[PDB]
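Q: Could you predict the 3D structure of Transmembrane protein 14A?
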Amino acid sequence: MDLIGFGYAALVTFGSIFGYKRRGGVPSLIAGLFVGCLAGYGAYRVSNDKRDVKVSLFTAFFLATIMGVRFKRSKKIMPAGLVAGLSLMMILRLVLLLL
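A: Sure. Here are the predicted structure tokens for Transmembrane protein 14A:
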């Protein structure tokens, strides 16, 4: 949409994003951030919940279990997306290790 300066858009995007005061859809990802968060964070707290990493496993497991229809290649990205989430997590964990 519109073939105008990109960089600029990347600038305003970066800033605005940082200010976080525009979005407002709450499709699901958000819910994934909250849940996943508690998962990781909690695992980091070390109170009772299992250890990190595994948590994620329990996150995807619970979610899927909540869904009913286990992952399955098909239209939309509702199911696949989930896999994209868990994956994204792992990767982030690959670096987290260092962090």
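Q: Anything worth pointing out?
A: The radius of gyration is 17 Å.
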